Scaffold this motif. Sequence first.
Motif, PDB file in Angstrom:
ATOM      1  N   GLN A  45       0.836  -1.194   0.000  1.00 57.84           N
ATOM      2  CA  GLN A  45       0.000   0.000   0.000  1.00 57.84           C
ATOM      3  C   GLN A  45       0.874   1.247   0.000  1.00 57.84           C
ATOM      4  O   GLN A  45       1.744   1.400   0.865  1.00 57.84           O
ATOM      5  CB  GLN A  45      -0.886  -0.001   1.245  1.00 57.84           C
ATOM      6  N   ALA A  52      -4.780   4.704   0.062  1.00 55.17           N
ATOM      7  CA  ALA A  52      -3.823   3.718  -0.396  1.00 55.17           C
ATOM      8  C   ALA A  52      -3.993   3.431  -1.882  1.00 55.17           C
ATOM      9  O   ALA A  52      -5.113   3.304  -2.396  1.00 55.17           O
ATOM     10  CB  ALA A  52      -4.002   2.416   0.386  1.00 55.17           C
ATOM     11  N   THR A  73      -2.644   0.293  -4.009  1.00 54.49           N
ATOM     12  CA  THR A  73      -1.998  -1.001  -3.825  1.00 54.49           C
ATOM     13  C   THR A  73      -1.322  -1.431  -5.115  1.00 54.49           C
ATOM     14  O   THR A  73      -1.971  -1.538  -6.164  1.00 54.49           O
ATOM     15  CB  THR A  73      -2.994  -2.064  -3.358  1.00 54.49           C
TER      16      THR A  73
END
Length: 330
Positions: A22, A27, A29
């Motif tokens: 993250q 975030a 990813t």
Amino acid sequence: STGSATTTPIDSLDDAYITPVQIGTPAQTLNLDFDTGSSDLWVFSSETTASEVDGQTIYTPSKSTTAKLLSGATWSISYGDGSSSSGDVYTDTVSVGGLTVTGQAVESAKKVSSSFTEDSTIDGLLGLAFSTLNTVSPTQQKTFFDNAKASLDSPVFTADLGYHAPGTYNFGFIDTTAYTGSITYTAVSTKQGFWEWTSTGYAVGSGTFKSTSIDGIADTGTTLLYLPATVVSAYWAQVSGAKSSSSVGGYVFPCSATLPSFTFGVGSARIVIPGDYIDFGPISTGSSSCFGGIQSSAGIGINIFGDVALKAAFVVFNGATTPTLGFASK
Ligand SMILES: O=S(=O)(c1cncc2ccccc12)N1CCCNCC1
């Protein structure tokens, strides 16, 4: 603190492993190749030349409220296989498996070489070698592990790579249920910036163990096991029909063969690589010649205990003041 993340082979041959990471806020990813043989955390990005992106997930720093451009900083890396990448640098929040580092240098690619473009499953690398190898200029940056270390319960990470199966990277603790027997620790030299150690020898199949010092690196970012020519010749001599092919670039063997195991020494302990781990499949689609997973290190200049070796073990990367490496069977 601790972290724990699953690592997954990118294909049916275990050609590399990806681990979700993250980056930023919110975030983003990305699936990164955790690489104990290098020291840069670099990603495909919104800045990467468009023709050099083909299916990768990109980091877009402008969408991260915690990203900050690191003024004047650039990076450029040239790996031992001839591949490369380069770009600029942000600091941002990076989390792996629940372990969070703020202010991590995230090296955003402006350029990547063709073999990265051609692998849509890898969104970048997360280096786990020593920070002395980091390429950021003019101010070298720290690895994710170095930044996390002081906060970790113990200053360690472990690699538990699977054969044709998922595995685990843990940070800050040793999962005593993840291996059999004991962990044997061995000395590390950081003089070249690697997790460099000396194996005590080898055996081929059920043959006698040869005691001999083999200096090499524990490198999760290299697929194969690269060893001295004498050792590799002794291994492939036990496979009927195997030959070193100059055109292919290494030892190949009939796909119908059953491969012997390969054992390497860690102190008095022994790690056994099953023969099946050494099969990398047809050299080209439809061929009955298969590529070997043990290859000569001649002209690399270093021996490399890559994934073929490491996936046969539970491996402790101990980043205490004097680093060491631990190996257990599993
Ligand atoms: O990760 S890599 O295996 C590597 C390099 N280029 C392209 C790749 C495409 C897919 C998977 C891996 C790749 N690599 C870089 C660090 C380790 N040194 C050896 C070469």
